Amino acid sequence: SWRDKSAKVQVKESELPSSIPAQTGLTFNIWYNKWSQGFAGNTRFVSPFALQPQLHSGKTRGDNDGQLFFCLFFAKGMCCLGPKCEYLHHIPDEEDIGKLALRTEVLDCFGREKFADYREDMGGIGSFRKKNKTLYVGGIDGALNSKHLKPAQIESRIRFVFSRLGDIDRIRYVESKNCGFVKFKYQANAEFAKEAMSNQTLLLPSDKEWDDRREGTGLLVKWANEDPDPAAQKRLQEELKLESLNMMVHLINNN
RNA sequence: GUAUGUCUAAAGUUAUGUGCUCUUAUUUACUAACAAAAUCAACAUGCUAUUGAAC
Numbered sequence: 001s002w003r004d005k006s007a008k009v010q011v012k013e014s015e016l017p018s019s020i021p022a023q024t025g026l027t028f029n030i031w032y033n034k035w036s037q038g039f040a041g042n043t044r045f046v047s048p049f050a051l052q053p054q055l056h057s058g059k060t061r062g063d064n065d066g067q068l069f070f071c072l073f074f075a076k077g078m079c080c081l082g083p084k085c086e087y088l089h090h091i092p093d094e095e096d097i098g099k100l101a102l103r104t105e106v107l108d109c110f111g112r113e114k115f116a117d118y119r120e121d122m123g124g125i126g127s128f129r130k131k132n133k134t135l136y137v138g139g140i141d142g143a144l145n146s147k148h149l150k151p152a153q154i155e156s157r158i159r160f161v162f163s164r165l166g167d168i169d170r171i172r173y174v175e176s177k178n179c180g181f182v183k184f185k186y187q188a189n190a191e192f193a194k195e196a197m198s199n200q201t202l203l204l205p206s207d208k209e210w211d212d213r214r215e216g217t218g219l220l221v222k223w224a225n226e227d228p229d230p231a232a233q234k235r236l237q238e239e240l241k242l243e244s245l246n247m248m249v250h251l252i253n254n255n
Numbered sequence: 256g257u258a259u260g261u262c263u264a265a266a267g268u269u270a271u272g273u274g275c276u277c278u279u280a281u282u283u284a285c286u287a288a289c290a291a292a293a294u295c296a297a298c299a300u301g302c303u304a305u306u307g308a309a310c
């Protein structure tokens with residue numbers, strides 16, 4: 001269990017990356033922390049860091065302080081504070097979902113405040129209106145450094161990495177669109193896994209490409225739109241009816 | 256007073272059907288919104304004319 005050990009320091013303070021982003025203009029703007037005077041070159045890059053849940057999970061100050069929220073940088077695999085962290089260093093579980101069950105309507109599991117509307121990009125923290133449990137997984141070609149790979153092989157990779165990060169309802173890979181969809185049991189695991197897998201590679205140490213994995217752009221993990229598949233739509237309607245019927249019990253017993 | 260407007264880099268895909276070396280501006284020089292109402296300082300000291308072949 002993660003409860004059996006103190007949390008590992010993922011990255012040392014001296015090993016942390018610089019705050020100045022890669023140059024895309026002629027002058028660095030000290031206010032905005034971004035380059036001005038021109039805009040050329042891509043801003044995406046592969047994360048140097050990746051979470052290793054069985055290795056890095058452990059107790060922190062947050063477990064003793066009665067903390068609710070998870071560590072954003074633990075998910076990113078780059079937390080500097082390790083066991084001195086105020087935030088929880090483990091994959092979310094039903095105990096902690098239960099502890100989050102009040103705040104979850106307006107907050108992320110990382111304690112970030114949700115928005116009314118999704119970004120046009122469908123990236124970011126997500127909407128307090130929707131209660132979405134599904135991640136879109138794009139940029140898969142860049143996440144493999146453009147290595148040719150069979151579709152079932154890609155699906156097996158996505159199955160491995162995302163299943164470390166929570167209980168899962170469904171994974172599907174679409175070959176024509178070259179994108180994956182991962183649905184979790186709890187929205188907190190979708191929130192967590194999005195930040196854990198954003199900008200990562202799908203490559204292995206076993207791959208021939210592993211020694212240049214940093215060169216491209218990583219995984220592009222976003223919120224999913226509603227599934228247009230009619231089978232999925234009627235499944236969604238069935239679970240909506242079931243949720244409604246389960247809620248009638250509470251309203252009746254309370255009044 | 257050196258106009259101004261639109262475009263695009265996006266994202267891969269949102270699930271169904273280093274050499275050499277010229278140069279006394281040898282520059283493709285560019286802008287006109289700006290101003291236009293120009294005359295003091297004139298001028299030398301005494302005015303001119305020219306040629307047809309032949310019966």
Ligand SMILES: [Mg+2]
Nearest residue numbers: 256258288289
């Ligand atoms: Mg004008």
Ligand SMILES: [Zn+2]
Nearest residue numbers: 071074079085
């Ligand atoms: Zn931390």
